[PDB]
Amino acid sequence: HMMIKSFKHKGLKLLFEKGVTSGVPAQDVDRINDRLQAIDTATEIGELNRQIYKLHPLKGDREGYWSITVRANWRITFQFINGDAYILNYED
Amino acid sequence: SHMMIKSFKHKGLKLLFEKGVTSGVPAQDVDRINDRLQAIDTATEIGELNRQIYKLHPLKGDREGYWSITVRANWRITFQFINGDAYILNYED
Amino acid sequence: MRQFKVSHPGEMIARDLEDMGVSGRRFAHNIGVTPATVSRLLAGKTALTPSLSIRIAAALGSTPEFWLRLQSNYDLRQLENQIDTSGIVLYG
Amino acid sequence: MRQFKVSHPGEMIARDLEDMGVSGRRFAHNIGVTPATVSRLLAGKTALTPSLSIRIAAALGSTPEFWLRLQSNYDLRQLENQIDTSGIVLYGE
């Protein structure tokens, strides 16, 4: 499959699955949806390495997780394995 | 870099795949084998190889864990398939 | 479940350019294609082609394969239920 | 290493039809496209499009994604010597 498999963030889940926007900032709806489309489409992590995304692996206790920037301090974080993305969260 | 053919047991297949050299496989099957290697290389999951003409099936003996697709008659390509990657490509039987 | 709204990659690129402060014209010059071609891409009126995917990756990052996968997945989502395959024989 | 010879999926399909005893004309009638369209596909003269991929998968098996991936990898390999991106600026540096 190689797709998004699970969401930690309920807002992301609602947007992704039903197009319901109440769980994310209104002005970020398309920006977040585009990034979700990217994460869902990528088959390997390198495909997410766009400058605007500021792709980097997290360290310490969240070793194994990755982060992409949505806007400013806000980011989407996830585990990425075999093209599958797990525990999508929207944070910071 | 990911989800491709990673290794060869059969040297003829390796030469064909990597250099297009035909000397290590039967001449009548060159294109047929090259197509099938292209399919195995392109597939990202095993179901994508499940074309009736391929007669896709998992092996069961000591070769459990391996897969088989038919080239022609009794000839087959065998391999391990994980992660979209194909390992130990062989041409046999 | 699959994503509710899947965008044409040209539209996604339009948003990214906007966020980056890059005009369509400036983008067109950089990747070496005509401004008309870019404008049509950005409005989702024309397909992200393989040669476009190579130029776009050089400018926006990621890989040509990724950009093409966005286009092909989008195209397949649009064609869903619009092609009746019920009368087609599966050989074998 | 990557595959040395990557074929246009039309060309692959042509060999498959032949191995199957299926004429291109017969194939065209079954999948619901004009024989002219198929003829061009089989000679590698025209692209395997998304709607063609849905029809082909219905007949030859596998998924529409697989067929499109064969085409996109083919197309990219073909362009390898025809696009200079060295003067293009990567935004974010």
Residue D74 · residue D68 · CB < 8 Å: no
Give helix C50-60 / helix C9-20 axis angle, nearest 10°: 20
> How far is residue B45's CA from residue C36's CA, in Å, rounded to a whole number?
39
> How far is residue A16's CA from residue C22's CA, in Å, rounded to a whole number?
28
Measured from the Cβ of residue A63, the count of other Cβ atoms closer than 10 Å reads 8
> How far is residue A37's CA from residue C11's CA, in Å, rounded to a whole number?
12
Structural domains in chain C, sorted by start: 1-82 (1.10.260.40)
Query: Could you tell me which residues of chain A have a Cβ less than 8 Å from any Cβ in chain C?
Result: 3-4, 15-19, 30-31, 33-34, 36-38, 40-43, 46-53, 71
> How far is residue D93's CA from residue D90's CA, in Å, rounded to a whole number?
7
DSSP A28: G
Residue B44 to residue A44, Cβ atoms within 8 A: no
Residue C88 to residue D53, Cβ atoms within 8 A: no
Which candidate in D22, D66, D68, D76 is best for mutational testing of the B interface (most B CBs within 10 A)? D66
Residue C17 · residue A34 · CB < 8 Å: no
Which residues lie below 8 Å from residue C43, measured CB to CB, with a gap of 6+?
Answer: C10, C11, C14
CA distance to A7, A32, A87, B77, C15, per residue, from A35 (Å): 14, 5, 15, 39, 11
Residue B1 to residue A46, Cβ atoms within 8 A: yes
* Torsional class of A82: left (φ above 0), alpha (ψ -120 to 50), beta (otherwise): left
> What's the resolution in A?
2.1
Q: What are phi and psi of B80, to 5 degrees?
A: -90, 145
Which chain B residues are within 8 Å of C90, Cβ to Cβ? Answer: 52
- Which residues, numbered 4 to 63 in chain C, qualify as contacts with chain D under a Cβ-Cβ cut-off of 8 Å? 20, 22, 30-32, 50-51, 53-55, 58-61
> Can you read off the two tokens belonging to residue C62?
């990621």
**Domain B1-93 CATH (choose: 2.30.30.90, 3.30.2310.20, 3.20.20.140, 1.10.760.10):** 3.30.2310.20
Nearest CA in chain B to A81: B83
> Can you read off the two tokens belonging to residue A76?
């989407």
Per-residue H/E/C for chain B = CCCCECCECCHHHHHHHHHCCCCCCCHHHHHHHHHHHHHHHHCCCHHHHCCHHHCCEECCCCCCCEEEEEEECCEEEEEEEECCEEEEEEEEC
Which residues lie below 8 Å from residue C92, measured CB to CB, with a gap of 6+?
Answer: B52, B53, D61
Using a CB–CB cutoff of 8 Å, tell me whether C81 touches chain D: no
Per-residue H/E/C for chain D = CCCCCCCCHHHHHHHHHHHHCCCHHHHHHHHCCCHHHHHHHHCCCCCCCHHHHHHHHHHHCCCHHHHHHHHHHHHHHHCCCCCCCCCCCCCCC
Distance from CA of D25 to the nearest CA of A (A): 35
- At residue A81, the 3 state secondary structure works out as strand
Residue B38 to residue D20, Cβ atoms within 8 A: no
Residue B49 to residue D7, Cβ atoms within 8 A: no
Write the class of the CATH domain A1-92: alpha beta
CA B78 to mean position of chain CA atoms: 5
Rg (CA), chain B: 12
> How far is residue A49's CA from residue C84's CA, in Å, rounded to a whole number?
38
Using a CB–CB cutoff of 8 Å, tell me whether D83 touches chain C: yes
Residue D1 to residue B18, Cβ atoms within 8 A: yes
Handedness of CA C27, C75, B42, A45 (dihedral sign): positive
**Regarding beta strands A65-71 and B57-58, do their DSSP bridges make them parallel or antiparallel, or are they unpaired?**
unpaired
Strands (E), chain A: 56-57, 65-71, 74-81, 84-91
Which chain D residues are within 8 Å of A69, Cβ to Cβ? Answer: none
DSSP A9: -
> How far is residue B1's CA from residue A82's CA, in Å, rounded to a whole number?
12
Among A21, A3, A11, smallest CA distance to A89 is for: A11
Which residues lie below 8 Å from residue A3, measured CB to CB, with a gap of 6+?
Answer: A40, A83, A84, A85, C2
Terminal-residue alpha carbon distance, chain A: 29
Order of strands, sheet of B75-82, starting from the edge strand that comes earlier in the sequence: B57-58, B66-72, B75-82, B85-92
Which chain B residues are within 8 Å of D20, Cβ to Cβ? Answer: 53
Which chain C residues are within 8 Å of B52, Cβ to Cβ? Answer: 90-92
